Write a protein that binds this DNA or RNA. Structure first.
Lengths: 411, 555
DNA sequence: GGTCGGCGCCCGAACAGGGACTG
DNA sequence: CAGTCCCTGTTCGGGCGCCG
């Protein structure tokens, strides 16, 4: 008996038409049981071929979770409804969330099933369940309520959500609560003990309205990975060439970098393994460049109207570096991950874990998901990435193949 | 007109476009008799109805012969309709494979007849399915009908039938959960572990459950005894194989003939292991006419004779046993060619296949092996929903060296080494640190965009030097040529300094094959060396001898 | 014959996007 | 600076094969 909020695509654009990729057995059995249940609760209903729209669907298991979770790849639908959840019903982003000692994530996707969806918009939420060896044709469904993973769901439920959070926000005014997609980020400066207690107070505060998770973050302990130069006492020709190449590349970020006096040590046609003493003018150009790399870049600041972009570099031995920017060489944040799950045995698992960690950080700091430049072949990524995904959102990505050049981000 | 017991799928046209208005083709007198005979019969059964001048639409129509029967099939040229109809999302996501079937006690196969003619069309859409039947006289106005069922030839007919068929089987499958029903269009593979007594009962129960909706299961197409003919195979209680394949024996081969040959050769490769189509596909490159006779090369005639020798022996596949693991083993057949076999017990292949796509201008066996594994993984998940364990002709240490040092992300699922030559290995390793006591070569190369001329050479720390003039070249070819020179005129251990990111990005990827002969010559020199260290320096920065050799190869 | 849909392969063409260079 | 072009990769159009 709830009134439906009318939604429309952006002008001059059709619905999404993306084919369903092949799914494993454990996934298909998980989707069948869920979909049959959601059909029995009226959340979804079967459709036919007359609907030309479709969206891929697969299943996941969150970290240290045993229950499967239905996940829809609404990236194409979200691109084609972007004007709704940014212009009319936008959500403000608290700049203090990233400054909290502890932030916790809560899957609140189950609440969106309480609000019906607009009848004219259900046609675009269509998806198909495949079968093993193509035993049966595609079993199609469509959503009859606010779908999980759609950007328009938290915008419609925002008015209802604020009223649920008001009695708790009043009792706890110093606690910051942000809502992105199917997750709820609650950050507080309290001690780890009474922090988790306040989480359970909220959890029960949402159970009484008709709604459970637990993933702790510490944004105050987030560090950046600067560009560092080696501290060698004996420098060879090869060492100085690698140093100049790195300083030359770093000059695109810090204009103050100079390699004039160091290039003077590379005048003769010398052997790479030959030891070269650093002149007085070179030892000073080296110390000055180390101080410029300590200074922050001039003129870097986040623009809300620009898309975030993230680049990832495989450094070997379980080392991965990343940089987030909107304009080239204007990096909003850098970093490095090490010893993630699958280190020293699996590179797709590490790359999948790195994207999730990076995306999570981008939501806490700016409230946006970046477009990734993944260092992997397209066919390699599209085969395994679903086997290691543990998150309810899916960022955009593209595939690059840049050979290493001068190890700029990792010694 | 009565109401059909099956629910009808609402179909619309695309907004802004009207129905088709196309004139009828001139038809042969033998086809007009076959059409009027079939038109007059379907109008008696309520499948087509007469229409008057109030229907301004029209579409062509014709008829083709049925395979191994005197009956004719009615087809409609809906090419102008299909353009303006709404788009449909097909529910057939692929084609079942016998390797995915499980051993069942009893098996039954049936095929309903005139499938599309037992499912109704949307009422509000029948007006746009208007066509004319030309009489034996050109002056006769002709009889005009409109379809009441799914017209054979319309783009929505297969989509609508598969979805309507699944809806009728759901109540049976919901009551009979332990019955496996493989539904592909009108054909139903039915199997169960129930005793043969209660099997035939559920069969009859389906044949009556399907009868309640106007779907007839004739006993002519009923199959109760093995072998079963299902999807072009021969299903036996313990093994399966494809229906016999016939290759053309043309004395004069045209482009189309090779295409029919290749296409068949592929179809077989799914159970016949060792089929190669490398030299036969080399005949289809750079050719323009589909009927251009083409002579067979010596390498293509040999490849064809081998394939004919593999098709003589009988081969068969087995069924999937969920209790035992899935295994897939790959071999290195030709340069750029790979084959594989998927099995659970040794020599009892579930299916075979081949992978031969050349991805990129520069590659190695390790890349192609990774591409092959990925193709098998996807195919396996399609058929069995799981990733097989892999037996790969690459040493464990060989692969560990590669993926750990490669800059891209790369990974292979659970696998084990199999000692089956030729083994995939890395033909050379670039050192990570400069070599002590090795001559150091500072190389560079440049060219002119207009004259197409350039120089390429090197300067070493021992005073050695060379510059070579090059004709009809580019900046990239010269920088590569300069590295080729340094490799030629050096010892077994050599340090090389360049400023070419293009050249360095290719060599570091450790390729063993390339489309460019200059790269292949560089590869051949890299294999002969014991230790090679490559390094990059920015150009035009007065670095070492890289500025001295930049000024020698400037023009 | 010159219908439709699904999937697979093989090829060239069109289009794409980055790097080094000179107007 | 902005325009090329040299190279490399991807996407697509069009031929069979197969199935119904």
């Amino acid at each position: 008996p709830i009134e439906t909020v009318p939604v429309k695509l952006k002008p001059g654009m059709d619905g999404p038409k993306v084919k369903q990729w092949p799914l494993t057995e454990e996934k298909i059995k998980a989707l069948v049981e869920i979909c049959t249940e959601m059909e029995k609760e009226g959340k979804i209903s079967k459709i036919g071929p007359e609907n030309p729209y479709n969206t891929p669907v697969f299943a996941i298991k969150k970290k240290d979770s045993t229950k499967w979770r239905k996940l829809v790849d609404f990236r194409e639908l979200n691109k084609r409804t972007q004007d709704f959840w940014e212009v009319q019903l936008g959500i403000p982003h608290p700049a203090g969330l990233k400054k909290k000692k502890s932030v916790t994530v809560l899957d609140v996707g189950d609440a969106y099933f309480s609000v019906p969806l607009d009848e004219d918009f259900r046609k675009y939420t269509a998806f198909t369940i495949p079968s093993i060896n193509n035993e049966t044709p595609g079993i199609r469904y469509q959503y009859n309520v606010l779908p999980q993973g759609w950007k328009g769901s938290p915008a419609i439920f925002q008015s209802s959500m604020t009223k649920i959070l008001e009695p708790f926000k009043k009792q706890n005014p110093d606690i910051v609560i942000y809502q992105y997609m199917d997750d709820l980020y609650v950050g507080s400066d309290l001690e780890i003990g009474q922090h988790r207690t306040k989480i359970e107070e909220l959890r029960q505060h949402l159970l009484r309205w008709g709604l459970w998770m637990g993933y702790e973050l510490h944004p105050d302990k987030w560090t950046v990975q600067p560009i560092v130069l080696p501290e060698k006492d004996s420098w060879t020709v090869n060492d100085i060439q690698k140093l100049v190449g790195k300083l030359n590349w770093a000059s695109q970020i810090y204009p103050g970098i100079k390699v004039r006096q160091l290039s003077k040590l590379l005048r003769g046609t010398k052997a790479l393994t030959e030891v070269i003493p650093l002149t007085e003018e070179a030892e000073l150009e080296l110390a000055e460049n180390r101080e410029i790399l300590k200074e922050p870049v001039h003129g870097v600041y986040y623009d809300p109207s620009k898309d975030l972009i993230a680049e990832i570099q495989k450094q070997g031995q379980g080392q991965w570096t990343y940089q987030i920017y909107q304009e080239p060489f204007k990096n909003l944040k850098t970093g490095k991950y090490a010893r993630m799950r699958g280190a020293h045995t699996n590179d797709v698992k590490q790359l999948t874990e790195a994207v999730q960690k990076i995306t999570t950080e981008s939501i806490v700091i700016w409230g946006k998901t970046p477009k990734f430049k993944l260092p992997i072949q397209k066919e390699t990524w599209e085969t395994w990435w679903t086997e290691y995904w543990q998150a309810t959102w899916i960022p955009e990505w593209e595939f690059v193949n840049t050979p290493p050049l001068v190890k700029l981000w990792y010694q | 007109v009565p109401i059909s017991p099956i629910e009808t799928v609402p179909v619309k046209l695309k907004p802004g476009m009207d129905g088709p208005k196309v004139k009828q083709w001139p038809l042969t007198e033998e086809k007009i008799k076959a059409l009027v005979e079939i038109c007059t019969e379907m109008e008696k059964e309520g499948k087509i109805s007469k229409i008057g001048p109030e229907n301004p639409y029209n579409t062509p129509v014709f008829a083709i012969k049925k395979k191994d029967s005197t009956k004719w099939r009615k087809l409609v040229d809906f090419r102008e309709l299909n353009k303006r109809t709404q788009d449909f999302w097909e529910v057939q996501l692929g084609i079942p494979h016998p390797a995915g079937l499980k051993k069942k006690k009893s098996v039954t196969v049936l095929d309903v007849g005139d499938a599309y003619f037992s499912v109704p069309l949307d009422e509000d859409f029948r007006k746009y399915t208007a066509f004319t039947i030309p009489s034996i006289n050109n002056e006769t106005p002709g009889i005009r009908y409109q379809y009441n069922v799914l017209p054979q030839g319309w783009k929505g007919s297969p989509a609508i039938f598969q979805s309507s068929m699944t809806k009728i089987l759901e109540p049976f499958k919901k009551q009979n959960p332990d019955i496996v029903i493989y539904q592909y269009m009108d054909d139903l593979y039915v199997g169960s572990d129930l005793e043969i007594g209660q099997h035939r009962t559920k069969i009859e129960e389906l044949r009556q459950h399907l009868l309640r909706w106007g779907l007839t299961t004739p006993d002519k197409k009923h199959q109760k005894e093995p072998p079963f003919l299902w999807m072009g195979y021969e299903l036996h209680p313990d093994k399966w194989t494809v229906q016999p394949i016939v290759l053309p024996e043309k004395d004069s081969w045209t482009v189309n003939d090779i295409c029919k040959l290749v296409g068949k050769l592929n179809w077989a490769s799914q159970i016949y292991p060792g089929i190669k189509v490398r030299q036969l596909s080399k005949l289809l490159r750079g050719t323009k006419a589909l009927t251009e006779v083409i002579p067979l090369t010596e390498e293509a005639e040999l490849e064809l004779a081998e394939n004919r020798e593999i098709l003589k022996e009988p081969v068969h596949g087995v069924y999937y046993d969920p209790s035992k693991d899935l295994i897939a083993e790959i071999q290195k057949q030709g340069q750029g060619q790979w084959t594989y076999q998927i099995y659970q017990e040794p020599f009892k292949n579930l299916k075979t296949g081949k992978y031969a796509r050349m991805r990129g201008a520069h590659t190695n066996d390790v890349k192609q092996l990774t591409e092959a594994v990925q193709k098998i993984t996807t195919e396996s998940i399609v058929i069995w929903g799981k990733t097989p364990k892999f037996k790969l002709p690459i040493q464990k240490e060989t692969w560990e060296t590669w993926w750990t040092e490669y800059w891209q992300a790369t990974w292979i699922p659970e696998w084990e080494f199999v000692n089956t030559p030729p083994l995939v290995k890395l033909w050379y390793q670039l050192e990570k640190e400069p070599i002590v006591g090795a001559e150091t070569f500072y190389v560079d190369g440049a060219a002119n965009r207009e004259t197409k001329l350039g120089k390429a050479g090197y300067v070493t720390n021992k005073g050695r030097q060379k510059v070579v003039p090059l004709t009809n070249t580019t900046n990239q070819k010269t920088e590569l040529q300069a590295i080729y020179l340094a490799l030629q005129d050096s010892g077994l251990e050599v340090n090389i300094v360049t400023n070419s990111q293009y050249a360095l990005g290719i060599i570091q990827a450790q390729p063993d094959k390339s489309e460019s002969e200059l790269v292949n010559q560089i590869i051949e020199q890299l294999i002969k060396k014991e230790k090679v260290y490559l390094a990059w320096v920015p150009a035009h920065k007065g670095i070492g001898g890289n500025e001295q050799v930049d000024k020698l190869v400037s023009a």
